[PDB]
Assembly symmetry: C3
Homo-oligomer: 665 residues x 3
């Protein structure tokens, strides 16, 4: 009667009833945490402003007179230029107002200040004539220009002799004008600047504006009237005019005020769904529409400290009105006056709170509390400042996304934390009637190690089991009683030994390999007896209360009490760099890098022309030498006579030679 | 016999058997939701194009003649310049083709149009001589230049008298040329522009191209041949040549066609793993390689409407061929003709679908369905357009990431939602045999409040329990029967009262503080009786069926049926701004801000030179006064004689004085 | 006695006891996975450097002499300029060192090289006089300038005759100077360049630096001394000076060494909380402070290969010292020497590891292992290189965020995976005593289909049930026995039929619609008998062991064993594009696009002036014709006499006429 387990994988445990010595208890439903109240989002409309870098850009009209006078020396079949003087000349005030404005013409004469002198240039070197302004030729992507002279003047051919030819052209050319903050100078598309502020005048203290030019160069015309140079129909509108002359030209333009025309800020974006939140001592402005969150201090930014920010109010007012009348007008209602929070990163924010008609009951609170939010801090003390604005926007996209992801994931994580907690709490009843049914199993699964257990009233008493090797356990074949039939064992018989040499000890195989000491599990004998029992890592099958054979585990088809669960972590992912256009594509997109251009235009020498070489040439170095010295004495004499006083005594002499000789004849 | 609970923390409940009045039932497995089919990703290869800002850049050759003529007036030991005329002159067509091209030389004479005149300048004021072109000096980061004259001319020294010195230099200089869309003008690295289109000619209707210049200035050479200026070996290739002259210079270049040379778009990126998805009426192109998703309308963009986008087809074809032959060629197969979807944000997309040999069975469908996707919308109506391309790329990284995060998190969230649902469904069996075992506990945990319960067939009947204070409950000491020994109580005896003054009412302490009314839980008396019982917030221990003492809870070692769960939400995180380089670092990286440069070069006056001061000086202001008036009359007379007709009568007079005097002698 | 189910929704199953044929088993606790060790983050301090685009910017002083000489021709009431020569002249070395430096004055004479000639210009055409340098007028946002002449010279009025007027102005103007890598040329704010390296000299082999200029133009002053031009107090410091002259001007500056002055890199950011991680064969540098992660190869970048990166060491050293003394000095301690990892994307990284005093035990290891990390790869072979740095930073923000999100979400996902696994394992005990209580239910829920079950020892035997339609099942009214009272059925009686025509078969309704064949569930008769039973999709209520009536399900109030679970997936979200400022706002912010400016300044012709028109004019074309031909012969003769040799014979003749006539008188 010698039988051992097929698989010694799982050791047998002999586990006796315990004493009241050791005794343990279960936990109880730890009061589970609760949800958060959630961040209160105040709906509103936003409009965000940015530092202006786009220069102030306007229109003006230029008036000038190109004065080009040339030497020409002649040969037998040929004429060469000996020098071309080429100048830009201002047109006087009166000649613009009278000859150019009213009559659309211009003097053929120039009279202007250059190089500490007055000059007067005759066109053709001929008598002054009022000449006509005719439209400039067809020109592409340019302004509309005008001129009098379409071709310059040059003297008639006198064989081998120097002539001078004067030419004057009265040109009018309307142009654009650009200006950068603080707007004290302005440029012309001709590359010429004007060193005067574009808003100077006589009206509302306009003498305050800085101009280096003396007051007389520029005059302002109150209630001025303009007439087109081609159409020549007077403009219906009366425009206050301004006219400033330079040593090269004279420009005129229409005058407008300052603050309702320029602004350090500029309107950047319009958000109809901007959500304000208050957290950790700051506001976050989440446009769900454009995926954006903004960080602002609690107090509104004081607009007064905004410099020249009169664009702000007007712009924000118009935009917000249009949006609210469009899409919010019958669903919510306005709450308080608009707010100008300062957006971390240099983005000026206009934000309008608003509440639904659904819960207008609350408006009193909200209104008061919105009014609390602008400080009157500038009032008790004027020093002004600009707003420094960045050029990248990514903190807001990333910050929004991380808060929306963060919102969802932490939200769900919380919900499932609660659900798990209350599930484990809910189980203890199942574990409680279950622990009542079979104490040994539940106590072993609970404490962690295999132990005995018995109910000691409303508590559980335990004591550690005893390990027993499989090669030291015997199965006896029979399950019936030879002495008393009709009442036979319900579970097989085992003869284990606690030590490989230890005495053989009989017992009754119990559930889950517990080699119970007492042989007391008897049932009445019954027909059709098929029983699979637990033994070692496998099973042991008896038919009709008698040892059939031992089986491995997978011999029997297998089902499960388990609900599958399949999680895959998010694999890593590298983020490669990327620029849309590189900065060298931009320095290259600049059709001319002025730097490169001048760098070339100034090597116009050392490449193919030497400046480190000096030449002295003498015609007389090039009895006969003595005679040549004689003409030099004459040559040096003529030098004394090349100039005024020596020259005067000679003209007086020349008068004599011809005079005296003839009167005698 | 007066005993009360150690801890009154938990009130006792007396809970009687119920009536059939109140009766409740359990829920049943709510059919759990199911997974989504998942978005079908169509593998393919992509190539994305962008607006061209890099100007069209090519090579050309300049030819000109610097004409510099100078006055020099002399003193005793010294010579001063009185004026330096300095001009740039064009080289005629023939002198380039004949003297410069074939012979590599150039005339020492200039003959060119300037200021409505023809001029002819002699080098040295000496007879025309064909002169040699020698290489320019060593120059760094420049082109390769050439010249004839390496040093200018100046007259010999004549004491106190004005001389003129002419100099002509024939210079050749090959340069780069840049051009911006629409490419009607092009620049030179010398800063000089040429107001003609770079593709003008006589071939395939090239008279269409706009040029303001008259046809005669520029000539095209069919089948032209070039020879190096230093190497002077003829180029093997025959190049159609173009030659345009300006009033300052003359440039020549090789001619090429238009559309196979320029393109409003430019190839930006090559993606071998671009995944197309269709969702919500749009396509999303997720390059897993570069972390990108693209949004496109359903229909392909019509390439024909792309302006000058003949670069597109060629480029995309070559690239996609190279990739597919490289890495996809034996695993997938091509599906349909390539596609040009328009990428929201202005990114033109070339996308090639493709399917695996694994499932080529489907190709018919896919092919047809891919062919359905380009519309023939331009055919029934030519108006063209450019593609406006942005300069930031972040919508795609953020949109990809949010879709991949979103994919993973919502995927796992769904899986666990299902698993929980079917777990709660799976539990009801446990709760069902468990609810059978001890109705009171399961009904109390279920309904939420402590109630009684008994099985009413296949359902459960309930009735609310009764609260009972602890200071109103007594434990009687004994647990055995004085009258009938051998059969003694299994649970202690209590004498509670429902009201602090209410009558004392006897009962038998039950499980979990239920003060059962009927005293009927009896077991046979047994040795070794140790029992911990539940009483109040604590326990009450009896030995041998007799009151020992009451204990607190933590007196007993504690185990648990709970599986720990530890979740931490994702802490907030602020995102600080950051620019790599600021825009002022770029306006500063521009080695010259042309704006700043001219702004300085035009204050070259008011800082250290006054223009508002005019000087009139008279030599005669500087009996003797009467004699001085006499020379003025002579001075003004000489003025009449300074000019032609007065001067003629004088030369005729001068002829007489010397003539008449001598013939008589 | 004819009764059928109210709702045929749920089919009845007749399910008999099984045979030992079919038999199944449960799963066992699959050993659950375990947590990861987590990535070891090495704390440290970082400083990251970037390619320098900000040019090297310094100060210098310019010295020059504007030489302006003018023709003026006069009329009766008027004077016109005939040509204004205007030049920039260098001031010689000695005149700067002696006249300008020591004495703060300057010569009124210019003597300089231009156009291969020496020239000497007299101011006023008057004797040389040392003149004073007086401060320039008030000028805004300019440097401080100086000059001698504040107003130019012009000749006195001689009626109808050409005069020349010379003017020289000695101007000093200190300016800024800019320079781009490789720093061989440098610009001036005047737009003029200087084609020499800014670090050339005589000290420590400074003859190596490239200059095209000959050595004589520029001289270096060892131990130079400067004195302010207004304050005129000598500077205390002795500065080595450098003086280079150009053909137009002469500039001077103080000399400094090279490598401790310029650097291809530049300090970009300072991170006190930079966390290094090692993973997948690379390092990731996560500044938690600025939301950043960096990717680097294992080996440090060899600084020696950094070109001119002597700024690097000094800068990183100072910064890291300041931070560590500030905030880390008593909590951690330094580990090893600093490290220069090369940041993927072109960002040079200085990184200092450090460990806490908490666990300094480990330092030996860490130190050694940190020292292992810089390679000595450059030593066995000098070739140098720059570092190419990008202009966008987003890979780091997105990569950091995706790793922090990824960290949290995968972390929690893992924890809950484990918890679920061990929960399902923990349940099997509940399912095991529960499976013991009622085999049919647990086997049916387990296998998936309704089956029979009975305990076959330590295993379970099953056999499939039989479906039975509801319209084929009868409820008999009574529940008591007519023959034997006092002992009556516990569950109602049914007469089903397996086929719509099949014979009627009696049985006893069991739990959950099992139509048990054997009628053997009897209890003793009892008062107050109310029983709800399960029947069809509904219930069937008997009072006092007799058919009352059948009810629907919702007739009874309903409770639940289920813990609610509410998950919402993250809704999709589109990310719209966005630029802060567009590139056209930048080309527009450039107050002058030099490209646009010159493009306008070169159409100063074709719009309003025709160059394609040539004029030939003849005064003589404008008996009398014969007499006019006579003056032309004289006119052409005077041409022969307009020049030297013909002119000499005439002056000799003129000498005779007056001479001979008078001596005879
Ligand atoms: C539950 O998990 C959290 C997060 O891992 C543990 O909190 C950390 O505990 C130690 C000591 O405080 C440190 O790793 C961190 O400082 C803690 N994280 C914090 C404060 O965010 C926590 O100990 C865990 N609880 C357990 C396992 O019972
Ligand atoms: C949000 O408002 C509600 C009541 O309006 C209240 O829970 C609390 O004041 C706010 N919750 C926060 C700030 O978490």
């Amino acid at each position: 009667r010698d039988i051992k387990a097929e698989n010694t994988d799982a050791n047998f445990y002999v586990c006796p009833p315990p004493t009241g010595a050791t005794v343990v208890q279960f936990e109880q439903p730890r009061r589970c945490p609760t949800r958060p109240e959630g961040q209160n989002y105040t709906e509103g409309i936003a409009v965000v402003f940015k530092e202006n870098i786009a220069p102030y850009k306007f229109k003006a009209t230029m008036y000038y007179k190109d004065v080009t006078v040339s030497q020409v020396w002649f040969g037998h079949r040929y004429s060469q230029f000996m020098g071309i003087f080429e100048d830009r000349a201002p047109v006087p005030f009166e000649e613009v107002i009278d000859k150019i404005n009213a009559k659309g013409v211009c003097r053929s004469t120039a009279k202007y200040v250059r190089n500490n002198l007055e000059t007067t240039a005759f066109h053709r070197d001929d008598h002054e004539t009022d000449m006509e302004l005719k439209p400039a030729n067809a020109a592409t992507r340019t302004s509309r220009g005008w001129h009098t002279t379409d071709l310059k003047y040059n003297p008639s051919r006198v064989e081998a002799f120097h002539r001078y030819g004067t030419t004057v052209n009265c040109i009018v050319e309307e142009v654009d004008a650009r200006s950068v903050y603080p707007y004290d100078e302005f440029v012309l598309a001709t590359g010429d600047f004007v060193y005067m502020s574009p808003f100077y005048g006589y009206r509302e203290g306009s003498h305050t504006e800085h101009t280096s030019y003396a007051a007389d160069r520029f005059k302002q015309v109150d209630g001025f009237y303009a007439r087109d140079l081609t159409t020549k129909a007077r403009a219906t509108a009366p425009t206050t005019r301004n006219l400033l002359t330079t040593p090269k030209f004279t420009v005129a333009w229409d005058w407008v005020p300052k603050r309702p025309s320029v602004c350090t800020m500029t309107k950047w974006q319009e958000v109809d769904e901007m959500l304000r939140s208050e957290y950790g001592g700051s506001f976050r402005f989440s446009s769900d529409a454009i995926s954006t969150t903004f960080t602002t201090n609690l107090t509104e930014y004081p607009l007064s400290r905004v410099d020249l920010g009169d664009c702000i109010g007007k712009d924000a007012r118009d935009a917000m009105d249009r949006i609210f009348a469009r899409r919010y007008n019958a669903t919510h209602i306005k709450v308080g006056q608009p707010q100008y929070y300062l957006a971390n990163g240099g983005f000026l924010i206009a934000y309008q709170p608003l509440l639904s008609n659904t819960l207008a009951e609350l408006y009193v609170r909200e209104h008061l509390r919105e009014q609390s939010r602008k400080p009157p801090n500038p009032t008790p003390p004027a020093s002004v400042e600009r707003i420094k604005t960045t050029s990248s926007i990514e903190f807001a996209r990333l910050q929004f996304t991380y808060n929306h992801i963060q919102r969802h994931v932490n939200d769900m994580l919380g919900r499932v934390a609660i659900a798990w907690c209350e599930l484990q709490n809910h189980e203890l009843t199942l574990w409680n009637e279950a622990r009542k049914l079979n104490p040994n199993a539940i106590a072993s699964v609970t404490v962690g190690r295999r132990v005995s257990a018995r109910m000691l009233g409303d508590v559980m008493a335990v004591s550690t089991c005893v390990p027993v090797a499989a090669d030291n356990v015997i199965v006896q074949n029979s399950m019936r009683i030879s002495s008393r039939p009709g009442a036979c064992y319900s579970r097989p018989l085992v003869s284990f030994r606690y030590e490989d040499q230890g005495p053989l000890v009989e017992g009754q195989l119990g559930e889950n390999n517990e080699l119970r000491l007492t042989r007391d599990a008897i049932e009445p004998c019954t027909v059709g007896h098929r029983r699979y029992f637990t033994f070692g890592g496998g099973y042991v099958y008896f038919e009709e209360y008698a040892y059939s054979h031992q089986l491995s585990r997978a011999d029997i088809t297998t089902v499960s009490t388990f609900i599958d669960l399949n999680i895959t972590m998010l694999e890593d992912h590298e983020f490669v760099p990327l620029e849309v256009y590189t900065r060298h594509e931009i320095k290259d997109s600049g059709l001319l890098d002025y730097t490169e251009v001048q760098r070339r235009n100034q090597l116009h020498d050392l490449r193919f022309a030497d400046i480190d070489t000096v030449i002295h040439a003498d015609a007389n170095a090039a009895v006969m030498g003595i005679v040549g010295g004689v003409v030099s004495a004459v040559s040096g004499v003529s030098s004394f006579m090349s100039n005024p006083f020596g020259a005067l005594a000679v003209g007086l002499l020349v008068l004599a030679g011809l005079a005296a000789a003839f009167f005698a004849f």
